[PDB]
């Protein structure tokens, strides 16, 4: 998820004429072009067509001025064109200029000037500045891709929300990598470190620095097995056992053999 802007800074129509080789609306008078523009984003393309569907999507602006102007909480001379794709850092940029003439018709020979540029383009890079000059116009204008806050990489397609709940704690780092909290770990970072020392072979834990032992298993470091209950003069290795000192016997080794 993120967006693509393009930011008009200049425009030229000296003469005040169409691409069609008319006046807008000896010079070609003074009722000038009421200029607005359109911006065309689509696939990338070998040979640059002026047909084809705008595919990424598409803007336009108001109308900013009469024949030539620069610009300059609303930019009328910016362009926001929002994806929800990945980036594909390869495509197509059309940009066209028209007049506007008060007519709820469309007028397709109303159109001042077209210029393409087909070129790739990441996120990472700020503002690329681009000239063109046309039969007819010369446009100066900066483009630049971003990703909408907790996105991130090449596409705008890595997400990273950072998160301290239910479901996991970590923070983002500036690549959009999960950094697990102190005390944390795993891939999504909602499994815990348990006290240093704790067998985890018999341990566990679901909060940070806790070891309890599994059935049969007790202590500390839950390294200690649990006899068999009421086990007197014998020891244990494995859980459940009542291995008797010498000279003593018996299930619970309380009977002496002496
Ligand atoms: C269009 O121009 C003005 C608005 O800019 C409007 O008042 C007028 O009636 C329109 N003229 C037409 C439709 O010829
Ligand atoms: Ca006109
Ligand atoms: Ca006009
Ligand atoms: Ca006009």
Same mark, same amino acid.
């Given at each position: ?12 129509? /000296?003469? +005040? ?8 609306? +000896? ?11 359109? /911006? ?16 990424? %999507? $598409? ?15 609303? #930019? ?24 506007? #003439? ?12 077209? /210029? ?14 681009? $000239? ?36 996991? $704690? ?31 072979? $018999?341990?566990?834990?679901? /909060?940070? @620095? ?19 209950? @009421? ?17 003593? %016997? @018996? ?8």
């Amino acid at each position: 998820m993120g967006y693509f802007e393009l930011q008009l800074s200049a425009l030229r129509n /000296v003469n +005040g004429e169409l691409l069609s080789g008319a006046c807008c609306d +000896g010079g070609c008078g003074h009722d000038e072009c009421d200029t607005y523009v359109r /911006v065309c984003l689509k696939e990338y393309q070998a040979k640059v067509t002026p047909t084809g569907p705008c595919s990424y %999507g $598409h803007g336009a602006t108001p109308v900013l001025g009469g024949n030539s102007f620069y610009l300059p909480d609303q #930019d009328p001379g910016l362009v926001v064109i929002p994806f929800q794709f990945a980036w594909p850092r390869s495509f197509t940029l059309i940009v066209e200029a028209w007049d506007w #003439d008060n007519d709820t018709t469309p007028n397709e020979e109303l159109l001042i000037e077209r /210029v393409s540029h087909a070129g790739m383009i990441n996120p990472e890079d700020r503002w690329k500045s681009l $000239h063109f000059s046309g039969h007819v116009a010369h446009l100066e204008l900066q483009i630049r891709v971003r990703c909408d806050e907790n996105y991130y990489s090449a596409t705008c397609n890595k997400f990273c929300r950072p998160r301290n709940d239910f479901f996991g $704690h970590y923070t983002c780092d500036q690549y959009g990598n999960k950094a697990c909290m102190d005390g944390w770990m795993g891939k999504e970072c909602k499994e815990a470190v348990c006290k240093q020392g704790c067998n985890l072979l $018999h341990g566990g834990c679901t /909060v940070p @620095g806790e070891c309890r032992c599994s059935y049969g298993w007790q202590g500390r470091f839950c390294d200690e097995c649990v006899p068999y209950p @009421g086990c007197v003069h014998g020891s244990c290795v494995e859980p459940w056992q009542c291995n008797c000192e010498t000279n003593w %016997g @018996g299930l619970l080794c309380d009977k002496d053999l002496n």
